Design an enzyme around this catalytic site. Structure first.
Site, PDB file in Angstrom:
ATOM      1  N   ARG A   1      35.791  38.794  39.860  1.00 40.67           N
ATOM      2  CA  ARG A   1      36.284  37.413  39.755  1.00 40.67           C
ATOM      3  C   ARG A   1      35.541  36.519  40.733  1.00 40.67           C
ATOM      4  O   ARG A   1      35.312  35.334  40.449  1.00 40.67           O
ATOM      5  CB  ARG A   1      37.781  37.341  40.049  1.00 40.67           C
TER       6      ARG A   1
ATOM      7  N   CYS B   1      36.807  39.012  45.782  1.00 41.63           N
ATOM      8  CA  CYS B   1      38.074  39.377  45.203  1.00 41.63           C
ATOM      9  C   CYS B   1      38.285  40.836  45.591  1.00 41.63           C
ATOM     10  O   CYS B   1      38.019  41.252  46.703  1.00 41.63           O
ATOM     11  CB  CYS B   1      38.143  39.184  43.699  1.00 41.63           C
TER      12      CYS B   1
END
Ligand SMILES: [Cl-]
Ligand SMILES: [Cl-]
Ligand SMILES: [Cl-]
Ligand SMILES: [Cl-]
Ligand SMILES: [Mg+2]
Ligand SMILES: [Mg+2]
Ligand SMILES: [Mg+2]
Ligand SMILES: [Mg+2]
Length: 424
Positions: free
Chosen positions: A385, A380
């Site tokens: 994430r 990410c």
């Protein structure tokens, strides 16, 4: 409420007109033998709809989102038929007239090898609050064969996330302990060794990680200070890479602990120091991909980079972060939309922050060619994430999954690297 027999349900398995609904906890659904059953998991094909959710106003919208419609033939089951009553009634209040209750899941189905069951392959890494309570209490718990543990409350530069309320006896770990705010990558092996020792962690310590969700707001200087459970899974990735052999993540983070009714502490627990981490760092280097290897993976039919970002990031409207200058995307990555922004994982989570029903994650991924026969590196902006997406794939038993740690930060920090912008 009407009843369905074992032989009836067996004969209907795999018919896509009957919808089997497991109203136990998501952890039981995933495989946890919460009541000592001989075989854990769910009836093959069942969907997860924990009865816990009946007290949330979200319940009916969740049912609809999972495509459960009044015309469907619904079969509910739980550990007991009595535990399905409220769910059956709520279905009937909302116009679902074809609802049956299966009474014989436990112990008749669980106890009989001939009846098909599925589970999250590596479910024991994703623990329920009852298991954490058992661990801290010194009680006999399944899926645990150690004598040394630590419960760690993750946060990004926000000790008040911990001091405002934490699991009893837990100590806090700033994500800055294991990742650099300069590279935004995991720290060097020398730094990792000392940081882990100074938080009382050896390679043979069972480490239970969790964080507190505090509603990240992009208006704020440090939104990640409020995304504590993404931060916890990020630390789980770094610890697993480094070589902590037994790392657990509390499913749903701090909210699962308080929802389970357990006690809350505000004590500032002093850290214990261990003299030796006890293993080479990193012991699982294959879990991390750096940028040279990531570029190779973009060139192979065997591998892919998986972009776990938001849509405004992906089309280059914004960088996603108040500490990342460039807006754009890595050419050739597969988009796996995270959710609403750089600090939310709605598409991978339930509303209570537990992981989304794993079959749903698998199905959405498959539509984009994110599949276990590939070596996948999830990434990410800087790896938070990406680590939670990676963890979900790890939990499914996918054999070749990594985090491309550098992400868009490291990619765009080199002006020679190509990038894309705009709607594809
Ligand atoms: Cl349960
Ligand atoms: Cl059983
Ligand atoms: Cl979070
Ligand atoms: Cl990207
Ligand atoms: Mg035992
Ligand atoms: Mg990184
Ligand atoms: Mg952050
Ligand atoms: Mg000490």
């Amino acid at each position: 409420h009407m009843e369905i027999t074992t032989d009836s349900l067996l004969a209907l398995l795999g018919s896509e007109k009957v919808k089997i609904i497991d109203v136990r906890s998501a952890d039981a659904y995933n495989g946890w033998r919460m009541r000592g059953e001989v075989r854990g998991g769910h009836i093959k094909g069942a969907k997860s709809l924990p009865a816990k959710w009946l007290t949330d106003p979200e319940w009916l919208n969740i049912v609809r989102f999972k495509q459960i419609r009044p015309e469907d033939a619904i079969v509910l089951y739980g550990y007991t038929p009595e535990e399905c009553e409220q769910t059956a009634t709520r279905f009937k209040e909302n116009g679902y007239n074809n609802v049956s209750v299966f009474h014989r899941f436990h112990p008749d189905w669980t106890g009989n090898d001939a009846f098909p069951m599925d589970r999250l392959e590596q479910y024991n890494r994703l623990v329920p609050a009852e298991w954490v309570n058992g661990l801290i209490s010194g009680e006999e718990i399944p899926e645990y064969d150690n004598d040394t543990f630590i419960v760690c409350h993750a946060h990004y530069r926000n000790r008040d996330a911990y001091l405002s309320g934490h699991i009893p006896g837990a100590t806090d770990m700033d994500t800055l302990a294991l990742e650099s705010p300069e590279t935004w990558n995991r720290r060097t092996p020398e730094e990792l060794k000392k940081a882990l020792e100074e938080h009382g962690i050896t390679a043979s310590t069972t480490v239970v990680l969790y964080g507190k969700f505090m509603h990240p707001d992009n208006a704020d200087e440090f939104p990640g200070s409020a995304a504590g459970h993404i931060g916890a899974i990020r630390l789980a990735f770094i610890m697993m890479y480094a070589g902590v052999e037994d790392v657990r993540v509390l499913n749903g983070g701090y909210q699962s602990w308080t929802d389970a009714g357990f006690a809350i502490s505000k004590d500032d627990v002093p850290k214990t120091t261990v003299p030796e981490f006890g293993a080479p760092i990193p012991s699982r280097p294959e879990f991390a991909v750096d940028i040279d290897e990531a570029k190779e993976m973009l060139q192979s039919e065997d591998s892919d980079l998986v972009c776990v970002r938001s849509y405004p990031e992906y089309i280059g409207e914004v960088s996603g972060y108040n500490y990342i200058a460039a807006a754009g995307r890595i050419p050739g990555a597969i988009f796996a939309e995270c959710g609403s922004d750089a600090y939310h994982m709605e598409n991978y989570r339930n509303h209570d922050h537990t992981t989304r029903e794993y079959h749903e994650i698998e199905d959405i991924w498959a539509k984009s060619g994110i599949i276990p026969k590939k070596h996948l590196a999830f990434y990410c902006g800087t790896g938070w994430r990406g680590s939670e997406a990676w963890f979900n794939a790890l939990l499914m038993g996918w054999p070749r999954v990594s985090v491309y740690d550098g992400g868009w930060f490291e990619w765009s920090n080199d002006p020679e690297n190509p990038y894309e912008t705009g709607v594809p």
